[PDB]
Amino acid sequence: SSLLVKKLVESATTPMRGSEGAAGYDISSVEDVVVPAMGRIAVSTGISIRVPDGTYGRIAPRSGLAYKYGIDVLAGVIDSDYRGEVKVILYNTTERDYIIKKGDRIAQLILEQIVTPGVAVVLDLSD
Amino acid sequence: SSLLVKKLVESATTPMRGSEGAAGYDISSVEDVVVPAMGRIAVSTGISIRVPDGTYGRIAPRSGLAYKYGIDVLAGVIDSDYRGEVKVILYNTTERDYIIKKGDRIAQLILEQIVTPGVAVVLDLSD
Amino acid sequence: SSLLVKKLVESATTPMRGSEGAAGYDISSVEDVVVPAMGRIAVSTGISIRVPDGTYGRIAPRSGLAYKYGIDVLAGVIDSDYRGEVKVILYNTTERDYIIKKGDRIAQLILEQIVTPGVAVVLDLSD
Ligand SMILES: O=c1ccn([C@H]2C[C@H](O)[C@@H](COP(=O)(O)OP(=O)(O)O)O2)c(=O)[nH]1
Ligand SMILES: O=c1ccn([C@H]2C[C@H](O)[C@@H](COP(=O)(O)OP(=O)(O)O)O2)c(=O)[nH]1
Ligand SMILES: O=c1ccn([C@H]2C[C@H](O)[C@@H](COP(=O)(O)OP(=O)(O)O)O2)c(=O)[nH]1
Ligand SMILES: [Mg+2]
């Protein structure tokens, strides 16, 4: 029901929500790195999570970094049984490099509800 | 419960759904612009929204523009408490430019259900 | 309620989930192709689906292909009334080409819950 969070390093930051009606929790870097121009990387968050059953955690793009620096968020699907560290793959769509300092909010964890019903095979999906 | 929509300009178009089983509402441009090759922009929708509590609005990619012109949708997370204008950041993955005329469907607003439970810290997520 | 699946070719593979807490079903290619460097394509899955009402199927990025080969997933929104073949548009963010063999897991189908309430127009979203 609640969102579980295991801290893996000193700096690690307990995911929180920027506001009441906020769609997601703030995922932040625990490392100083550089998302190279037209390049990509996996940033360290220093944390591992367990999204509530009946949902999966989506690593979603932060508006600011997107509009101003053209930072895209690759991958992003964290399954509810996954126990490893959350990595945030970042793609720099720009010709310019982009710098990340420990503590910067690099993304947001949205807890999206899904369904995992069984799969039946048919010959006709209509009607 | 319903999807609220405040119109900000003349041209603004009340978000609607292309069909009964449609996943989202049609977000359209209220400006004539050009998403430059290997470039990006924030298109004006002329509208502000309030997605139903218990969800957030996702600006999602339209299939056609994606397959034919390689148009990607950056950012995209609209929180339920946000009151400003909805901007649709578009990334042109192609070497060719791409033109948008007022009224063109530039994306789709999907209302996705999420959860915002409190966050507990543990030492072990398993078991 | 269940996830319907119509097989369109010999090779077609009945979508399954890699694990109990898995967020999505494994979508795989039924064709040998190459996502060109800084290029994109629509891969054939040999299948058509009908996601449960009250949800839409999201073609989501697979972590491995993202981190190691910089493969992004364009479009991705499959509506619940859609009856055609599921195509997986893939964008190669790298300078290197990328090869897909029949049977390779090219993505994952996440069944996300949404809402499609009516749309009301207001002058003020706040309060
Ligand atoms: O593609 C997008 C993504 C977000 N927003 C809106 C929704 C959200 O409520 C607000 C967020 O701005 P911000 O998050 O406060 O700035 P930042 O992302 O740098 O924290 O911008 C858009 O209009 N278009
Ligand atoms: O990556 C994708 C995205 C969408 N579709 C399917 C789902 C949807 O039901 C249909 C939509 O085609 P369209 O929306 O009618 O064309 P357009 O996007 O130009 O409106 O295509 C795919 O097969 N692959
Ligand atoms: O941006 C992402 C996407 C996924 N994961 C985690 C969540 C998931 O549980 C695990 C999946 O690794 P994998 O799927 O087993 O490898 P592959 O994608 O090649 O199947 O990686 C991340 O840390 N960051
Ligand atoms: Mg993307």
From TrEMBL, chains A, B, C:
InterPro entries: dUTPase, dUTPase-like, dUTPase-like_sf, dUTPase_trimeric
One Pfam family from the record: dUTPase
Residues engaged in binding Mg(2+): 72
UniProt keyword annotations, A-Z: Hydrolase, Metal-binding, Nucleotide metabolism
Enzyme class at the top of the EC tree: hydrolase
GO biological process per UniProt: dUMP biosynthetic process; dUTP catabolic process
Binding-site list for dUDP: 62-64, 76, 79, 87
Molecular function terms, GO-annotated: dUTP diphosphatase activity; magnesium ion binding
Domain annotation dUTPase-like: ranges: 12-127
EC number: 3.6.1.23
Described purpose of this protein according to its UniProt entry: This enzyme is involved in nucleotide metabolism: it produces dUMP, the immediate precursor of thymidine nucleotides and it decreases the intracellular concentration of dUTP so that uracil cannot be incorporated into DNA.
Family statement drawn from the similarity comment of this UniProt entry: Belongs to the dUTPase family.
PANTHER family: DEOXYURIDINE 5'-TRIPHOSPHATE NUCLEOTIDOHYDROLASE
NCBIfam families per the UniProt record, alphabetical: dut, PRK00601.1
Name listed for the protein in its UniProt record: dUTP diphosphatase
Gene behind this protein: IL-3A_613L
